[PDB]
């Protein structure tokens, strides 16, 4: 149910949206951006991940 | 064209068809049957008779 929903929502990818083609040095920055509302979770993006 | 209680609260009917005859007094079954038990009717062979 709800757990699924939340997870599916985040994983799903959408056309451009806010900040398509940004570049992040690691995950924590992602979250900061989302929480400031200048980045949607659905945006396709380039991240450096270990 | 409605009574005082209805004037006080008219609900907007969307019903596209007119109920012709009225919704009969639902709890009539019981009274009618029981009333038959006591019915003073010489010929009508029911209940007491």
């Amino acid at each position: 149910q709800d757990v699924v929903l939340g997870l599916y929502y985040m994983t799903r990818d959408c056309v451009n949206a806010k900040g398509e083609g940004m570049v992040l040095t690691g995950p924590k920055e992602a979250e900061r951006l989302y929480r400031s509302g200048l980045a949607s979770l659905h945006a396709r993006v380039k991240v450096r991940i270990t | 064209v409605y009574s005082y209680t209805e004037k006080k609260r008219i609900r907007k009917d969307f019903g596209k068809r007119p109920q012709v005859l009225d919704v009969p007094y639902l709890l009539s079954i019981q009274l009618d049957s029981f009333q038959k038990f006591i019915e003073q009717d010489p010929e009508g062979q029911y209940g007491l008779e």
Partner: protein, 100 residues
Amino acid sequence: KPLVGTGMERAVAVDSGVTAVAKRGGVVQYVDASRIVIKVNEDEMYPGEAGIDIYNLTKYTRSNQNTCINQMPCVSLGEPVERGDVLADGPSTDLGELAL
């Protein structure tokens, strides 16, 4: 009052018979949260007895399921009513209507 009804809520209330309905209609003489006394239309009034209809209301008794049984008077004093007007409501009832 149920905002989204079928119209059927009026009939449900009326038939349950836990409300008080007006036998004759006319004008309300006395209103109490306990008694509703009504003076009849001279049109309808019997030349046998007086034209005074009495409704002692039942207030706050125990139902079988531990529920409360509370009647509330609906009309106000000196108000006009006709035959079959809803005078006092049972507990789950608004002005005429079923209020579950």
